[PDB]
Every structure is written in C-alpha cells, then in structure tokens.
Write a protein that binds this ligand. Structure first.
Ligand SMILES: NC(=O)c1ccc[n+]([C@@H]2O[C@H](COP(=O)([O-])OP(=O)(O)OC[C@H]3O[C@@H](n4cnc5c(N)ncnc54)[C@H](OP(=O)(O)O)[C@@H]3O)[C@@H](O)[C@H]2O)c1
Ligand SMILES: O=C(O)COc1cc(F)ccc1C(=O)NCc1cccc([N+](=O)[O-])c1
Length: 316
C-alpha cells in the first residue's frame, strides 16, 4: 500500500489525512502537531469548522521547527456555501490561506453543491426557518474555482457532496478548463457508495471518504443510530487481524483506492489511526464490510432538502 495517490493535476495526495471538524480550537493545535510528529502529511480543513487559525498555528510551528517541509504537506480546505458567488470566492480562499498561514492550498473543494445567500450567517434563514439559497449555480462557482488555480492560490480544485449528476454537470461544463481532482463524500460500511465511487474513479476523479468511523461526536447523534465502532461484526474482523475496530474502518477505504480522513484530538488515537499500513484486509473481509451498507448518513442535510441543488434526492 503506497502512501500517496496520483491526482489528475499531476500531484500526489496522501491517502491518510487528519480530519478537523469538531476539533475544539483549544485542542486542535496540539492534535495537528502530534499528527505531523507521528507521520501525517495531509490535513482536512474548512472555513465553516471555525478552527483554521488554530490548525494553522500547528502547521506553521512544524514548518518552523523543520519537522516537515511545505512541499511534503498536503493541506485541503473548502469553500463554504455562503461564498458561491463569483466575486466572493477569491476572498474566501484568501481568508482560509491567511488563517492556515499558507501561501497556497494543495486542494480547495466546493464544500457542498448548495449555494446560500451571502452574509455573516453560515446558514441564512427566512422567517419560517428555511435556508435562503443563492442564485449562483455549480458551473459559475466552478469557473471561479478554476481562476484560483490560474492565480497560484491553489494547486488543485475539487468538489464535495456532489451526486453523480452534479459531477457530470461539471464534467460536461461548456469550456471546462480543469476537471475536479477529488470528490469528498461520506463513506463507511453503512454507506458504501459503490455507484458514486465507480463513476468518479472511471472519470479519473479521486474519492475521499469522510466520517469513516461514523462520526460518533456528530452533534445530532441519537442513541438509536447504528454505531460502526461498536458493531460486533466489525470488531470480529479487527480481532482476527489483531487491530482495533478504528484501524479496520480506516484500512477499508484505503483498499478501495480512496483517501480517508479520520478525525481525532486524542494523541493516542491520532497515532493509532496512522498504524494502518502494515496489514491487509482480505477480499472476503472487504466484501463482508461492503455487505453492511444501509444507506445511513452522518451528514444527511435534512434542513436543506428543498434546495434546487440538495444532493441526496438522487439514488446517487
Ligand atoms: N466534506 C464534508 O462535507 C465533510 C463532512 C463530514 C466530515 N468531513 C471531514 O471528515 C473528517 C472525519 O469525519 P468526522 O469528523 O465526521 O468523524 P470520524 O472521523 O468518523 O469520527 C470522529 C470521532 O471518532 C473518534 N475517534 C477517532 N479515532 C478513534 C479511535 N481510534 N477509537 C475510537 N474513537 C475514535 C473521535 O474522538 P476524539 O476526537 O475525541 O479522539 C471523534 O469522536 C471531519 O473531521 C472533516 O475533516 C467532511
Ligand atoms: O459539512 C461538513 O463538513 C460537516 O457538517 C457541518 C459542519 C459545520 F461546521 C457546520 C455545518 C455542517 C452541516 O450542517 N453539514 C451538512 C450540510 C451543509 C450544507 C448543505 C447540506 N446539504 O445537504 O445540502 C448539508
């Protein structure tokens, strides 16, 4: 298992990265420092996570310490929904760059296909509680992303939470200049994503799997929800391989040619989650894990289902 996957922009992306959604600002600097110290070279970020400044403190310290060189790091962020208009994209990217202490991103993603009204609120609401959409579509937002490549702000651009028809829309964009390098989507044994993964891979788009552990700290968790880390069937595969359940859950997408971005702020788990390059799941293990699909989403976006561009009506 090689550590990096070749993107369609010619750059290599580490297949294991550290997630940062929900990482508290007072803990994420140490989390990222530990991650870099134990071998991580890819950090997944976003402006909407409200902790990019603190992630950046860690990156800058490790660069200053010469633990790593900038060229060895692969830093990803995402354009939030209230910045889809063409005149806001550059400033949104530049705020992320400033916060992260960087002069370029390795990858910048459209975070969700849904554009929302610009303003201070990340979810602008009407008086009846619906999110207020923007009238800027995925194709004009894509053109604005392409400009960022041509200005040197980002090395690669991609998409996140795009369904296959939305991916196709960009691939079919009149005058398309750069194809999306990555589609970052939720993926784990309860949401196995066979259809969307094969489509993206067939087009040379690399898929990153988010919430690979089932996001046990998601703010809307309910006790009745299924739990990957506690599933006895997955625990049994882990025991057979003398690994933890989390390690199996991280290795699983790796063997599907996916990138995977488990989140932790716990030093011992950050280190544990990286020790996944020294064992192999069998084909039978892989097919068994795939069999657990139930189309269950951590990020279902139920408050966004009437948006012209809500992604999860379509089968995939
Ligand atoms: N593009 C998108 O729309 C989108 C959406 C969701 C997520 N993401 C990205 O994907 C990342 C990962 O997804 P996620 O944060 O939803 O959840 P996740 O990575 O599936 O799970 C994180 C949770 O698992 C715990 N954990 C981590 N390692 C563990 C281990 N070895 N044993 C037991 N528990 C462990 C963490 O606890 P501690 O931190 O307390 O250790 C935390 O509660 C995000 O942080 C974000 O970067 C992107
Ligand atoms: O979107 C993520 O990366 C994780 O989830 C969130 C993180 C945040 F910091 C804030 C909000 C979310 C969140 O609600 N994310 C879900 C979401 C957002 C936008 C649009 C949709 N949609 O289905 O169209 C869904």
């Amino acid at each position: 298992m090689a550590s990096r996957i070749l993107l369609n922009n010619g750059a290599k992306m580490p297949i294991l990265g550290l997630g940062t959604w929900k990482s508290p600002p007072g803990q994420v600097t140490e989390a990222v420092k530990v991650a870099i110290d134990v071998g991580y070279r890819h950090i997944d970020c976003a402006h909407v996570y409200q902790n990019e400044n603190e992630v950046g403190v860690a990156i800058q310290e490790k660069l200053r310490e010469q633990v790593v060189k900038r060229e060895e790091l692969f830093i990803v962020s995402k354009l939030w929904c209230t910045y889809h208009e063409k005149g806001l994209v550059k400033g949104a990217c530049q705020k992320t760059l400033s916060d992260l202490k960087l002069d370029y991103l390795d990858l910048y993603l459209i975070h969700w296909p849904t554009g929302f009204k610009p303003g201070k609120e990340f979810f602008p609401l009407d008086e009846s509680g619906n999110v207020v959409p923007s009238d800027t579509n995925i194709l004009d937002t894509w053109a604005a992303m392409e400009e960022l490549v041509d200005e040197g702000l980002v090395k690669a651009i991609g998409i996140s939470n795009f369904n296959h028809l939305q991916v196709e829309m960009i691939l079919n964009k009149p005058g398309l200049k750069y194809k999306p390098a990555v589609n970052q989507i939720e993926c784990h044994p309860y949401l196995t994503q066979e259809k969307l993964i094969q489509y993206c891979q067939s087009k040379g788009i690399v898929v990153t799997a988010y919430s690979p552990l089932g996001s046990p700290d998601r703010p809307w968790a309910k006790p009745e929800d299924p739990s990957l880390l506690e599933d006895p069937r997955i625990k049994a595969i882990a025991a057979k391989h003398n690994k933890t359940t989390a390690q199996v859950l991280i290795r699983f997408p790796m063997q599907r040619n996916l990138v995977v971005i488990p989140k932790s702020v716990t030093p011992e788990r950050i280190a544990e989650n990286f020790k996944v390059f020294d064992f192999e799941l069998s084909s039978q293990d892989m097919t068994t894990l795939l069999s657990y699909n139930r189309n269950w989403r951590v990020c279902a976006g139920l408050s966004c289902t009437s948006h012209k561009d809500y992604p999860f009506h379509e089968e995939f």
